[PDB]
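Teaching assistant here, posting this on the class forum so everyone can see the example we discussed in section. The complex has four components, and the goal was to see what a joint structure prediction looks like when all of them are supplied at once.
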Amino acid sequence: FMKGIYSALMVPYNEDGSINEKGLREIIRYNIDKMKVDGLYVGGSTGENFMISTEEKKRVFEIAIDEAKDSVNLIAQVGSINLNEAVELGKYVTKLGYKCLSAVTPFYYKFDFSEIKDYYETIVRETGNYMIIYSIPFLTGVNMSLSQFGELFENEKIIGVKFTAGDFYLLERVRKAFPDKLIFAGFDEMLLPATVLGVDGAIGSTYNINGIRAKQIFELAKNSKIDEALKIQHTTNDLIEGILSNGLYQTIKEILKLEGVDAGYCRKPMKKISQKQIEFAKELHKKFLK
Amino acid sequence: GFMKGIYSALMVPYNEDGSINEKGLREIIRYNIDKMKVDGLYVGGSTGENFMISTEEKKRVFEIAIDEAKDSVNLIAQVGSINLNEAVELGKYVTKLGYKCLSAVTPFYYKFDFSEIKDYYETIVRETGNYMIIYSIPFLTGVNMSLSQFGELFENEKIIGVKFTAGDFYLLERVRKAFPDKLIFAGFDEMLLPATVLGVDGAIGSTYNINGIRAKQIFELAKNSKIDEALKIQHTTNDLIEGILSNGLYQTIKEILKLEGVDAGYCRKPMKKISQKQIEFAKELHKKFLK
Amino acid sequence: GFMKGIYSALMVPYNEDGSINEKGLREIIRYNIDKMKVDGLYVGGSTGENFMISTEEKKRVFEIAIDEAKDSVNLIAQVGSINLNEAVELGKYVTKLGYKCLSAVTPFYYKFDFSEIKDYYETIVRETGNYMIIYSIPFLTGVNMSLSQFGELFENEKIIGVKFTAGDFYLLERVRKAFPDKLIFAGFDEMLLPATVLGVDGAIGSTYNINGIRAKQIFELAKNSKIDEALKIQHTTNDLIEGILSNGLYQTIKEILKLEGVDAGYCRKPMKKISQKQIEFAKELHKKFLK
Amino acid sequence: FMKGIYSALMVPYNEDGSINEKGLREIIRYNIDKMKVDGLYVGGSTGENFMISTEEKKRVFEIAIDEAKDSVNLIAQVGSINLNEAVELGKYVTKLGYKCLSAVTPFYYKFDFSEIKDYYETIVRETGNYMIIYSIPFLTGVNMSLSQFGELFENEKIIGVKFTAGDFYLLERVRKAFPDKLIFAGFDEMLLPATVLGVDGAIGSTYNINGIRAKQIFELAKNSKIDEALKIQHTTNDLIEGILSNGLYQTIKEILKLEGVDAGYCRKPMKKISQKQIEFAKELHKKFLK
């Protein structure tokens, strides 16, 4: 029921570093109305979201839920810092109406798997909400074993997993071992291969600007029209190759400003986008998205 | 363009004393051609324990293979591995024997820069006059070549394709669009369905010695946009591969080939002999997936 | 130049409810200063589970540490981790409290290029006016900085040194010769003797909470060219460290500190509690190596 | 008794690719007389030695043993290809008089440890010679565990190990667990740190041209004169930094030609050394070695 394309909301910032509330609402509206996404992924690692305070993470969650209402599905990423920040955020967004959570493991310590399980099971026990897990524990690089997925999926309110690494063998194994769980692709350049292996959705940050093509790839592949889907994936990956060449986070923001959305400013010590990269973003915009 | 299809990576059987079992070799070729109905044979690949044999034992394998297969199937001769002079000597031997396509891994004895890899491949093409399939990863470096590096190699018209060994589907898709006129072979059997929908022209694998039927079906069904049926067969194939890998891939394939009446030969020291527990597991996999 | 010597990486003790155990914190400081006779304390480091605490809990730790240590030892305040605004806010807080040296890991939320790392460090130096020790590896990248990148950072005169976390002794030797006027700290206790003979000015480690005596001896004996005696103590130190690592380093250090009368506090969820088997093993190591 | 500095002999080649016999003798003489090395390491991975035939590997071993006689220790590396080539080479060099062997594991297969042990134990059983093992199985990157060293060192004719990776923690552990075995450093840039941890010798290819400084570092460190040894190591590493900057294999050969030794030609497809790199090798020669 949570299927479809999700855009990873990137939070825009004012000149002074605070959150640009009206700019945040404009990005939500652009994703819902123009990109016609099936959901929003709020609080993800995308861009520079993990640096903001707990207080500012809570204001972003409330602004998002009040502007999106339920035109779309919403998932709240509440992990990363530690387990009690995850629980406080998890019960705040549960009280705001967020019907699903996700959590990356904490960054301050390399936890064994038995502590990953306690971490995830505690967020489900203390919030009562649904949970999406990550196939890779935060900053470890190693995918979880298929046996470890089974131990986590024994909990019924852990309803899915977001794949960040493009291991399609493990993806296929998880897909067959757990036909009742949701699997989200977290790689936009390989959406077509993921869709034919039966993923239920995709979460990406390019879908802020390329959501239309992604919904077509997702829909055409689930109806076995591979010839047309591969051709759109070829065009999508020419956009992504240019965006990556040009700096992905800043190119997406610069393209959003070319579409009439105030995507805000960057926070130090990140270097400002150059004139050559602004002109290159406009060439990408006119070639692929206008 | 005629070299599309599923290829089996021939594994060389050995006698008790370590020499090659010529009649076991002929029976494996017949099994792949008649029962597996493969579209071609990949001879001389790194698969199993083939890189340990002498160049002269390599010449006898190439001659036995072309003489047992006739022209029922495509043949690709892997002539690299050791050095450039053995690659050229092997490359001209198998070209005179009738092989119409070559492949070559870079030599193992040195970490060559790209400008010396290109001279390596271009020299084998000039001295044999044969077609060439390159590897996306230089031997024992782990890093895929850049898309610009593919362009410099693909400037040669007798470098007709590339065998992908790492499952980087982003790079696979980029190479596919940048060079629509070149052949691309998947070298990963567990991900055949994803590679096929991105437009690979064939697959070279060692599981096709025993699972060639399912692989041909996945390849044909996916190229005809019937993903639902193709995904179910890929699921069954990966249940076999997961068991084969759990049990030791090289030895399980050999023991399964012996359960169907093919003399797969013996192992060479210092490789350990397969256990009774693994023979029984190979038999369960055989009865469950292939009988 | 006055900040040479052995430094202990303070591990913050926690109460049963997760808040910081202030009196346990004072007792750990006293144990390091009086019994271990360390030359300084490294406060706020990634060691153990310190990066999980709030900035406000970080401010109370910095204030407790400077007030318990007075000026018996050098103090370095690690103010990085979260972002640049917390680093600058922390950096000016501990500068007003009397800390004479800072260190900062790069932020964790983004993979910064080098030109943004340099702005990061130069901004903390300009906004606090304090001295700065950099890390040879940007937080969560794994790759050491280039020797040219060290030169661009060391152009700032208030960047007085570098803490090496990876044991690359070739790069350590190159940095040592290229910048004889800068401080270099080893951050690997198992290789103290090799780092000292290459001219490191000190060591920052977490084993020095309990093995500071042996580490000071290795440091002093090696800088006075008595390698034979220094190697024997390094052998004993590494027998302790091998046991500590086998048993879980963070929890074994805490349990050993409790065997000598220091309230090392409790663990925070989701970390698992130490077993009886590991408590008994910590006691054997204590009786064998430190009593 | 095998202590000291060993030079890794690099085989010079004629214009046609064959072995330059008189050039090989000249390199042996330069290492024995001018570099005053304590031994020669023949057949190692250095340069481009692993490509030559078994026949040409046998001629190199005999030329080396007949020109060096016993002015120096000799170790013969007989592994890499497969186990029966290792045994044939091992008994040939045992019949030539080589009193110690070494062997890297085969390249054609990723052997488990129980097959590494059978591999090494077979070369010792079939030749009766002494054996030096490598801490890293050929092309795997992973050091052996200290428990695995113990299982191998249970054989008394496996007398030592050559360390290729600079893990000084593992080096110190192996040194203490087996005080009766030889340990050779295989990293010239870190000779001083290795010497203070009690290594019995060093095997390197820079010792073809920098053997004098290396013997001084080795001798000064074993007599606790660290101040003088570190200063020579600083100078040695300035040479090595330049050699590496310039291409190590070709710079060493070009420096040997600047010292009056016919170090031969390169084999295709290796690119020939440039004029800028020849001039740079001469600057290194005049600055560090003349």
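For the discussion questions: DSSP finds eleven helices and eight strands in chain C. Residues 1-291 of chain C form a domain with the TIM Barrel fold (CATH 3.20.20.70). Think about how each of these relates to the inputs above.
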